[PDB]
Amino acid sequence: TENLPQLKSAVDGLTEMSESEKSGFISLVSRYLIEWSKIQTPTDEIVVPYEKMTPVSQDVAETKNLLDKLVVLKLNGGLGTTMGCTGPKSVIEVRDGLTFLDLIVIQIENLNNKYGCKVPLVLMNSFNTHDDTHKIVEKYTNSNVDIHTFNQSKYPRVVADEFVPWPSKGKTDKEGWYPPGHGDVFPALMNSGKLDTFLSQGKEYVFVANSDNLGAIVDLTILKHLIQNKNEYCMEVTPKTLADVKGGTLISYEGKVQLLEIAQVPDEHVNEFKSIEKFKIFNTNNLWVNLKAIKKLVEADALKMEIIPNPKEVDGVKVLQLETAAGAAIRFFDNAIGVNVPRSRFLPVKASSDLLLVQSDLYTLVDGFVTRNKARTNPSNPSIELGPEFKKVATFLSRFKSIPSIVELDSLKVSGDVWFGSSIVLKGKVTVAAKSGVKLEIPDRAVVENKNINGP
Ligand SMILES: O=c1ccn([C@@H]2O[C@H](COP(=O)(O)OP(=O)(O)O[C@H]3O[C@H](CO)[C@@H](O)[C@H](O)[C@H]3O)[C@@H](O)[C@H]2O)c(=O)[nH]1
């Protein structure tokens, strides 16, 4: 529906929304209420190859000067629900009993203890993760890193049929609201005052990343490039692969580079994105942004990102949750670029199949970094697919007495009730399928190479 003044009225009726939230929400709604025959590929001048960038000098002074201007920030608004875990997704243990946050903290600690810098870490969480995060972060109280947190905007989900805020019908508990996407990082950094708290200290850029992307580590070649070339925004993209279905690509449109996402794509064109031909790059959501520019553009209300409707059905009630993507803000910044980086900077962990990959001998932890085995000569990881039986992390761990060796694996598909013993080795293309009513136990020490195991 589209009665806007009617919508504003109800929004102001919702007392728990702060004034700044009511405003930002109404602006989104207002704007809510793609000539494919023009889409272009960005030139190499706009999307710079990382290998062409100049590394820092041997004098640590240059490193300290750059680090003294930096603030690191992570995206932590999500829960561990997909992987059968309660709490923030960042607090799931990924490698060696260390959580995603623990590894990110170690990494920055290693930076601060290494260079004598005091780069601060900022966590942007959601109401669906704030208090739990608040509790966990205290563990790092004496760590050599200042951990800052803040909550991004809390907006009312909108009932789609009648177009009114769900809280107005009385859905005022947690399921009545939602965080408006990571694009909200810009106004929320302002609303939180952290931006002004960092500007009063000297920071100039924020490195933004998904909390569950293990490949998102600080890269000095990239930070250097933005400083010397005055790039106010840099989006790390990676070559698009068959695995990259759900996400965005960077495109040139109207002579500027911009994120292209599914809502903007005409019906008769959805598989071309999926292709490996038309679009050859894919956003990793590792974003580098200039802080003064964020302040300037948020206060001027310039960040007009495309809306992502994300519809859901809760308790039966079909609702709409309008959101935005951080990468879509790239078209509003000056001298903005994409940098095409190797997939080692893009290791998302979204299912227990990814944990199998990261807990196996394909990787090891090195000073807080999940480091790929170099004995793996072929860059690509093995494709791993596990049935629902492996969905909950605890059940996944119960089903692998030890994580099997997969350095020599091309692909593993597991289905049905399957339990694995310790010290197993898997090579090539492997499948294990237990039929209904059957439980399959892979004994300890088994070597499975290019085999289809369909029963005892
Ligand atoms: O309201 C929200 C929405 C998400 N997140 C966090 O944002 C991160 C990214 O979200 P996620 O759903 O994992 O990914 P998408 O938003 O689908 O994609 C992002 O990340 C992909 C790289 O993994 C890029 O290709 C896409 O351009 C970029 O939008 C996660 O850590 C979330 O915790 C928030 O902080 N707040």
From Swiss-Prot:
Gene3D superfamilies in alphabetical order: Hexapeptide repeat proteins, Spore Coat Polysaccharide Biosynthesis Protein SpsA, Chain A
Reported phenotype of the disruption mutant: Reduced number of seeds. The double mutants upg1 and ugp2 display severe growth defects and male sterility due to the absence of callose deposition around microspores.
GO cellular component: cytosol; plasma membrane; pollen tube
InterPro entries: Nucleotide-diphossugar_trans, UDPGP_fam, UDPGP_trans
Function (record text): Converts glucose 1-phosphate to UDP-glucose, which is the major glycosyl donor for polysaccharides. Acts redundantly with UGP1 and is essential for the synthesis of sucrose, starch and cell wall, and callose deposition.
The name this protein goes by in its record: UTP--glucose-1-phosphate uridylyltransferase 2
Extent of the signal sequence: none
UniProt catalytic activity: alpha-D-glucose 1-phosphate + UTP + H(+) = UDP-alpha-D-glucose + diphosphate
Family designation: Belongs to the UDPGP type 1 family.
Annotated keywords: Acetylation, Cytoplasm, Nucleotidyltransferase, Transferase
Alphabetized SUPFAM superfamilies for the sequence: Nucleotide-diphospho-sugar transferases (SSF53448)
Origin superkingdom: Eukaryota
Keyword Acetylation belongs to the record: yes
